[PDB]
Amino acid sequence: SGFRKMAFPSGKVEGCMVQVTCGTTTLNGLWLDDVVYCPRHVICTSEDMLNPNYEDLLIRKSNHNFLVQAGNVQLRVIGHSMQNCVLKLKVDTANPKTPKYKFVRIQPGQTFSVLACYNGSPSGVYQCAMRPNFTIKGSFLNGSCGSVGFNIDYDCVSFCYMHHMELPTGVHAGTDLEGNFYGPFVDRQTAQAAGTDTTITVNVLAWLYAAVINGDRWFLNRFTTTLNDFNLVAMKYNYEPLTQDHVDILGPLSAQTGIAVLDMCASLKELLQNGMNGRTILGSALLEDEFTPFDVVRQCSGVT
Amino acid sequence: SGFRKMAFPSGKVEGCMVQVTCGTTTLNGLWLDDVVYCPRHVICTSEDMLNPNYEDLLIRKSNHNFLVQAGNVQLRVIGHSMQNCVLKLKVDTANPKTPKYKFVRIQPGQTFSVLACYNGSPSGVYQCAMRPNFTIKGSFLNGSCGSVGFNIDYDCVSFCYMHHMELPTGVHAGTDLEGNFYGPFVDRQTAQAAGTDTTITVNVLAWLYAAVINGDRWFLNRFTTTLNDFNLVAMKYNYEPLTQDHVDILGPLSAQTGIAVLDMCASLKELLQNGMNGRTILGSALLEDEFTPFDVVRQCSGVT
Ligand SMILES: Cc1ccncc1NC(=O)[C@H](C)c1cccc(Cl)c1
Numbered sequence: 001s002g003f004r005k006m007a008f009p010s011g012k013v014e015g016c017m018v019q020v021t022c023g024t025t026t027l028n029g030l031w032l033d034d035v036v037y038c039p040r041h042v043i044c045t046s047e048d049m050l051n052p053n054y055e056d057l058l059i060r061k062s063n064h065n066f067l068v069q070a071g072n073v074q075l076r077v078i079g080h081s082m083q084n085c086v087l088k089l090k091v092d093t094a095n096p097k098t099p100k101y102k103f104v105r106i107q108p109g110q111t112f113s114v115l116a117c118y119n120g121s122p123s124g125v126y127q128c129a130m131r132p133n134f135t136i137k138g139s140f141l142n143g144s145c146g147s148v149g150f151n152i153d154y155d156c157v158s159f160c161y162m163h164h165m166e167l168p169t170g171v172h173a174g175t176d177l178e179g180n181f182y183g184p185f186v187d188r189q190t191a192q193a194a195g196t197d198t199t200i201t202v203n204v205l206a207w208l209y210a211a212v213i214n215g216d217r218w219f220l221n222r223f224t225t226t227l228n229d230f231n232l233v234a235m236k237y238n239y240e241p242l243t244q245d246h247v248d249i250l251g252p253l254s255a256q257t258g259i260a261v262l263d264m265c266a267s268l269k270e271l272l273q274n275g276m277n278g279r280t281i282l283g284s285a286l287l288e289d290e291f292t293p294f295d296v297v298r299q300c301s302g303v304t
Numbered sequence: 305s306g307f308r309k310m311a312f313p314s315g316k317v318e319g320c321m322v323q324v325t326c327g328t329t330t331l332n333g334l335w336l337d338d339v340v341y342c343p344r345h346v347i348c349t350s351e352d353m354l355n356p357n358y359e360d361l362l363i364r365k366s367n368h369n370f371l372v373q374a375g376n377v378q379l380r381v382i383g384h385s386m387q388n389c390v391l392k393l394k395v396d397t398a399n400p401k402t403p404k405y406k407f408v409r410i411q412p413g414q415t416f417s418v419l420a421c422y423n424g425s426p427s428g429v430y431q432c433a434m435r436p437n438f439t440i441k442g443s444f445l446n447g448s449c450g451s452v453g454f455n456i457d458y459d460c461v462s463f464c465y466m467h468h469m470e471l472p473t474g475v476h477a478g479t480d481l482e483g484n485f486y487g488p489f490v491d492r493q494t495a496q497a498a499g500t501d502t503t504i505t506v507n508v509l510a511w512l513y514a515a516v517i518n519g520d521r522w523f524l525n526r527f528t529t530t531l532n533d534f535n536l537v538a539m540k541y542n543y544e545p546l547t548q549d550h551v552d553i554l555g556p557l558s559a560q561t562g563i564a565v566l567d568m569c570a571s572l573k574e575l576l577q578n579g580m581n582g583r584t585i586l587g588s589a590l591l592e593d594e595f596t597p598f599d600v601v602r603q604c605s606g607v608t
């Protein structure tokens with residue numbers, strides 16, 4: 001029992017972190033096989049970031065200008081290429097610690113663990129959600145660029161995120177491992193607005209099931225609702241509309257607890273309309289949306 | 305910017321997790337150098353747990369009855385001893401992945417990362433606090449026994465906790481790495497009460513400083529208080545009394561923000577007396593107490 005914002009064990013990812021220096025800029029890189037991946041803005045000075053022409057900036061750089069250091073040893077760079085917003089540095093040595101891995105582009109509302117790094121060194125791990133507006137509310141300081149988000153399925157690490165930028169609002173933006181930004185963001189020191197964010201409804205419902213499983217049941221009521229009625233409430237409270245696909249993924253939790261998805265929707269409806277009245281659910285005084293139905297099933301069953 | 309419940313990178317600890325089986329019971333062990341540490345209740349059957357005589361139960365066991373498996377390979381047990389509530393299995397091979405380490409007994413209110421494990425396999429990492437009543441509000445299922453809590457200072461892992469038991473209330477109890485329980489708990493299937501828990505005042509204050517650093521300042525007021533006046537409020541709201549030692553550890557945060565500790569106490573006093581009025585601080589609708597002043601300084605500066 002107990003329910004925690006749990007992150008994946010970060011070991012397999014720690015073995016991949018390297019420090020990349022180009023000119024006077026240092027950030028983190030991901031060394032997988034014989035390739036080091038990092039944000040392309042490693043090649044810019046602070047003055048370049050205002051309006052960078054990355055093609056022109058990269059043309060002034062050679063293999064020998066990219067300094068890659070893994071722990072305490074130096075990697076020899078034999079090729080460099082830009083793919084979207086990421087640089088790929090071909091090295092002459094394959095990382096002996098390369099885990100089984102994939103590069104995946106996650107959907108908004110999905111969760112992942114972040115290994116926050118500085119100078120190629122891991123400092124912390126936390127679990128977070130890709131917001132519906134494609135931002136992440138991380139914890140990143142200058143030098144954290146190149147830190148990655150990932151999920152793990154038994155022995156396979158699926159890298160889904162690379163940190164690039166902190167927006168003027170303090171929220172974070174980044175790319176998939178092919179360098180494509182999540183959201184409408186560009187890697188430039190220009191004010192950029194993130195869309196209106198919404199609460200991930202299916203995740204809140206999954207979290208309400210985790211609460212019932214762990215004994216927090218005060219919010220269960222004698223009511224039920226319809227998808228249409230629930231969506232009227234969701235719209236008013238800036239919750240993502242619930243679809244039959246979301247109901248389907250909640251099936252295993254509905255099966256375990258015996259509480260039909262639409263009965264849980266009616267509990268959620270009442271909490272949205274009445275608040276928590278000073279009570280807590282799983283030690284939280286607000287509706288938590290950073291646990292997917294898959295995360296609740298995994299945590300509540302002990303998937304290693 | 306951003307503030308997360310961040311755990312230490314778990315890599316160095318993952319390399320130490322093993323599976324220990326004795327009879328029909330399997331749990332997790334910690335392999336450091338040529339010794340495997342695990343909860344002594346690995347030797348009990350479900351029937352033994354009601355009122356176990358561990359000395360008598362261990363006398364029926366030999367080195368060959370303890371099966372230790374690290375990943376996929378078997379460790380040869382050449383010695384066994386009980387130290388308080390932990391068994392120490394001497395193995396013929398030193399763990400090649402043994403990090404620099406220490407065994408430390410943490411104080412209540414201190415924080416640590418937990419690597420939750422099942423069958424010697426890591427499944428998740430989360431950060432938590434040792435409650436003032438010596439319990440931890442973890443996330444543990446059957447088979448999680450032997451999972452450990454730790455802190456990391458550059459390259460040194462300080463192990464502070466080993467999970468043993470889930471109390472009838474759903475909270476967790478365990479030992480230091482010498483097998484001494486934190487709190488008044490015994491390793492027996494008998495109802496055991498944890499003391500009245502209190503909120504870790506110094507941690508809430510540290511977290512209010514993290515909020516000011518990250519831009520959440522609405523709770524700052526035009527008031528100040530005295531240690532005596534603040535402690536009257538703390539007593540009424542079941543907060544630990546603040547001492548000059550706590551004020552002293554908050555000095556670096558007071559120095560950074562320019563908000564005197566007693567001015568922050570007056571903000572905390574007003575939040576205790578008025579609640580949050582439907583507002584949030586660092587994405588939380590309640591006063592967070594799982595970040596020490598050291599954790600806030602480390603996270604807010606980027607200590608790797
Ligand atoms: C300062 C900081 C804090 C947290 N995350 C990232 C950062 N770093 C940045 O945002 C850096 C300086 C940057 C500027 C403009 C565009 C891009 Cl792609 C990257």
Ligand SMILES: Cc1ccncc1NC(=O)[C@H](C)c1cccc(Cl)c1
Nearest residue numbers: 345444445446468469470491492493
């Ligand atoms: C079931 C479970 C869930 C979460 N944590 C630990 C556990 N496991 C236990 O509490 C085990 C069965 C146990 C019983 C009585 C005393 C002791 Cl020392 C250990």
